[PDB]
Amino acid sequence: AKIVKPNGEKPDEFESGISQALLELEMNSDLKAQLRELNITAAKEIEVGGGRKAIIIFVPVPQLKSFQKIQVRLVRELEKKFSGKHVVFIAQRRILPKPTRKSKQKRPRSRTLTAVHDAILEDLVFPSEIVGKRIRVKLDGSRLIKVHLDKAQQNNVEHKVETFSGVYKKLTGKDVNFEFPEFQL
Amino acid sequence: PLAKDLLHPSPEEEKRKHKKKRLVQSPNSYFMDVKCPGCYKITTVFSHAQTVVLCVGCSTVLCQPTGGKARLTEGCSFRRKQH
Amino acid sequence: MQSNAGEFVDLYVPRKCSASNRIIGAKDHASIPMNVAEVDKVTGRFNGQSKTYAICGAIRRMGESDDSILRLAKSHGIVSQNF
Amino acid sequence: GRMHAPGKGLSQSALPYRRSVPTWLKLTSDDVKEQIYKLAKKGLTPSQIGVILRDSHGVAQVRFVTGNKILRILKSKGLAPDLPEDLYHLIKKAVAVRKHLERNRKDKDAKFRLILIESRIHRLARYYKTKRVLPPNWKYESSTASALV
Amino acid sequence: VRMNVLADALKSINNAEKRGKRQVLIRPCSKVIVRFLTVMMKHGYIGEFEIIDDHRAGKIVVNLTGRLNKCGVISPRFDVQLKDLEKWQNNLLPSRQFGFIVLTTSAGIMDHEEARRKHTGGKILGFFF
RNA sequence: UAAAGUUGCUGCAGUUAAAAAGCUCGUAGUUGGAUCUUGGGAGCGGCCGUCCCCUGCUCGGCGCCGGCCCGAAGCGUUUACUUUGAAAAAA
């Protein structure tokens, strides 16, 4: 319906239902001109630790900034529809491998493992924006990124923190926590 | 003192320090909603302006450049805006 | 300090600073070993046991010994966390 | 530590952590570029453009608001100068000093400061020839310099 | 100017541990410093550290025990065959019973003892005991 | 030759013992900031260990109703480095 798969293939009945649920917001509510051109690439249902589920919606990259205007507006209606789930909007960042000895154009820094994993994290937490990354390299050797979100929208998006940590963990495999520094701004 | 919380500088200590030498680099400037009482429009002026920011549709000249922070002309008020 | 058979062969195992872990040599006469007595949490009397602390002369000459006992008694619960 | 001084100054501009645009700034990237074109047409450098913008129009960094930076916005459309602004300003300063030193042969301090400025030029010239943003045939000569305003 | 960033780091945490600091800021940051530190951590010489991400090169904040007698860089990064690695640990460590030359192999930045069992030489970065 | 760390790459010295150019610019020389892949799939021992995988398109053998799995060529950022291999008179 609005779920334009990147490969020449088909969406699932869940994923087509989410894209019809975006038609349900288009052909009823007054954000209808701001859902016509906005397509979807994928969507997944991500079982986080404990008895909780979240829904993750991958998006076309040049259409991402159009979602960033209309984020919480739209997140309300999609989150009450799938009542107990958390709904989050990431762009589908294509991610080229590191050009080796064995294997043509210069691989740009945008399309790189680190810039993908950092730009995902930036537009993972949207209403709050990141005011410092910290990384515990713990005694066993493994990293634990500590993302310091904005003090504004703490009351808005604190409930999504342990979701956000799961959403990022399932995507990249990187163990993350989200904190709120109060002492500056 | 041997033991200092190098990761957790108390905000009294951080605002004291040189901007570059702060644990994370952070400026001492800010944008101002400068409004003159003669005109209607709120202009956005930079604190350390270093130019003569004028009233567009001339009712006055708002700020005058100095060493550090510009002098906001007597009559003008300012809100510091943030994100 | 242990042999192929697993025997402790060194003729004494040294003490070492409860602050900075520096082994406290046989002729460090500046080194300060303190006994801090603990108390019954409703009576307020000496129980008979203590939380013993040992500082190398070096940190004591630096003058940081004060803060180092103050930390070791805070993380030990002897002293108020609020402080 | 400075190039041609004993000065160990630390007067640096210090960008904030958050590269993310602020909220209040209502100008879209296109109208910022349109205003950059308007300043460039008046006859300003990317240094002077950036100052005038952040003062009167509350736009901290053009790179933060748009994607690109002010010379690359000038250069794409062709409002950028033929020879860089900073190497222009040293050649401009060297022509100023050399004019002063035409009728002041006694001014030995000037003559020494001229040699320091000449060295700044040759040093930048050599850099821009590695990046081919000047011709390899180019070389700053002080007799040819007064035509380069 | 600053040229060997791993030198600035190891000298700064050496200076700091001699002074008896519980932790130390090392205020440029490279991936080579971070691999070197993780090697010093695996052998328990330094405590679990922390890389502060500004949007320039990082700053690291390193918890210290009193175990690190000295860390240090070898500049320049000399090439070391498996033949030569005895003569380095002979003249650059305080005993055979402890101390570790870090040397960047192809396999990865690691101690001299793993460079033996992996059977890969490379460039000496530094050493610690 | 060692002793000579009294030629110092390992490894010396240069305030006063011998020693830093009067000062600065400056070309070859030498040295040069940060940054560009990671998570897991397969298996064993008692949470931790040791292994296989994470480039693509002309000629045939474990097979199948023009191609699928795989074998052998040839193109594949370029070097230093490290490990292996060939080859390197004996005395």
Swiss-Prot record, chain A:
Its main location: cytoplasm. It is found in: Cytoplasm, Cytoskeleton, Microtubule organizing center, Centrosome; Cytoplasm; Nucleus, Nucleolus. GO terms for molecular function: structural constituent of ribosome. One of its GO terms (cellular component) is cytosolic small ribosomal subunit. Keywords: Acetylation, Cytoplasm, Cytoskeleton, Isopeptide bond, Nucleus, Ribonucleoprotein, Ribosomal protein, Ubl conjugation. Phosphorylated by NEK6. Ubiquitinated. Deubiquitinated by DESI2, leading to its stabilization. InterPro entries: Ribosomal_eS7, Ribosomal_eS7_CS. The modification N6-acetyllysine is found at K69. There is a cross-link at K65, K69 (Glycyl lysine isopeptide (Lys-Gly) (interchain with G-Cter in SUMO2)). One of its GO terms (biological process) is ribosomal small subunit biogenesis. Component of the small ribosomal subunit. The ribosome is a large ribonucleoprotein complex responsible for the synthesis of proteins in the cell. Required for rRNA maturation. Part of the small subunit (SSU) processome, first precursor of the small eukaryotic ribosomal subunit. Belongs to the eukaryotic ribosomal protein eS7 family. Component of the small ribosomal subunit. Part of the small subunit (SSU) processome, composed of more than 70 proteins and the RNA chaperone small nucleolar RNA (snoRNA) U3. Binds IPO9 with high affinity. Interacts with NEK6. Interacts with DESI2. Interacts with IPO5, IPO7 and KPNB1; these interactions may be involved in RPS7 nuclear import for the assembly of ribosomal subunits. This is Small ribosomal subunit protein eS7.
From Swiss-Prot, chain C:
There is a cross-link at K41 (Glycyl lysine isopeptide (Lys-Gly) (interchain with G-Cter in SUMO2)). The keyword Transport does not apply. It is found in: Cytoplasm, Cytosol; Cytoplasm; Rough endoplasmic reticulum. One of its GO terms (biological process) is translation. The keyword 4Fe-4S does not apply. Pfam families: Ribosomal_S21e (PF01249). One of its GO terms (cellular component) is ribonucleoprotein complex. It comes from the Eukaryota. InterPro entries: Ribosomal_eS21 (IPR001931), Ribosomal_eS21_CS (IPR018279), Ribosomal_eS21_sf (IPR038579). One of its GO terms (molecular function) is structural constituent of ribosome. PROSITE patterns: RIBOSOMAL_S21E (PS00996). Its main location: cytoplasm. Keywords: Acetylation, Cytoplasm, Endoplasmic reticulum, Isopeptide bond, Ribonucleoprotein, Ribosomal protein, Ubl conjugation. The modification N-acetylmethionine is found at M1. Component of the small ribosomal subunit. The ribosome is a large ribonucleoprotein complex responsible for the synthesis of proteins in the cell. PANTHER family: 40S RIBOSOMAL PROTEIN S21 (PTHR10442). Belongs to the eukaryotic ribosomal protein eS21 family. Component of the 40S small ribosomal subunit. This is Small ribosomal subunit protein eS21. The lineage of its organism: Eukaryota, Metazoa, Chordata, Craniata, Vertebrata. The gene is RPS21.
UniProtKB/Swiss-Prot annotation, chain D:
It is found in: Cytoplasm; Nucleus, Nucleolus. InterPro entries: Ribosomal_uS15, Ribosomal_uS15_arc_euk, Ribosomal_uS15_N, uS15_NS1_RNA-bd_sf. Keywords: Acetylation, Cytoplasm, Isopeptide bond, Nucleus, Phosphoprotein, Ribonucleoprotein, Ribosomal protein, Ubl conjugation. The modification N6-succinyllysine is found at K26, K33. The modification N6-acetyllysine is found at K26. The modification Phosphoserine is found at S29. There is a cross-link at K42 (Glycyl lysine isopeptide (Lys-Gly) (interchain with G-Cter in SUMO2)). There is a cross-link at K26 (Glycyl lysine isopeptide (Lys-Gly) (interchain with G-Cter in ubiquitin)). The modification Phosphotyrosine is found at Y37. Ubiquitinated at Lys-26 by RNF14 and RNF25 in response to ribosome collisions (ribosome stalling). One of its GO terms (biological process) is translation. HAMAP family: Ribosomal_uS15_A. Component of the small ribosomal subunit. The ribosome is a large ribonucleoprotein complex responsible for the synthesis of proteins in the cell. Part of the small subunit (SSU) processome, first precursor of the small eukaryotic ribosomal subunit. During the assembly of the SSU processome in the nucleolus, many ribosome biogenesis factors, an RNA chaperone and ribosomal proteins associate with the nascent pre-rRNA and work in concert to generate RNA folding, modifications, rearrangements and cleavage as well as targeted degradation of pre-ribosomal RNA by the RNA exosome. PANTHER family: RIBOSOMAL PROTEIN S15P/S13E (PTHR11885), SMALL RIBOSOMAL SUBUNIT PROTEIN US15 (PTHR11885:SF6). This is Small ribosomal subunit protein uS15. It comes from Oryctolagus cuniculus (Rabbit).
Curated annotation (Swiss-Prot), chain E:
InterPro entries: Ribosomal_uS8, Ribosomal_uS8_CS, Ribosomal_uS8_sf. It is found in: Cytoplasm; Nucleus, Nucleolus. This is Small ribosomal subunit protein uS8. Keywords: Cytoplasm, Nucleus, Ribonucleoprotein, Ribosomal protein. SUPFAM superfamilies: Ribosomal protein S8. Component of the 40S ribosomal subunit. Part of the small subunit (SSU) processome, composed of more than 70 proteins and the RNA chaperone small nucleolar RNA (snoRNA) U3. HAMAP family: Ribosomal_uS8_A. One of its GO terms (molecular function) is structural constituent of ribosome. Belongs to the universal ribosomal protein uS8 family. Component of the small ribosomal subunit. Part of the small subunit (SSU) processome, first precursor of the small eukaryotic ribosomal subunit. During the assembly of the SSU processome in the nucleolus, many ribosome biogenesis factors, an RNA chaperone and ribosomal proteins associate with the nascent pre-rRNA and work in concert to generate RNA folding, modifications, rearrangements and cleavage as well as targeted degradation of pre-ribosomal RNA by the RNA exosome. Required for proper erythropoiesis. GO terms for biological process: translation. The modification N6-succinyllysine is found at K87. Its main location: cytoplasm. The keyword Signal does not apply. One of its GO terms (cellular component) is cytosolic ribosome. The lineage of its organism: Eukaryota, Metazoa, Chordata, Craniata, Vertebrata. It comes from Oryctolagus cuniculus (Rabbit). It holds the Pfam family Ribosomal_S8.
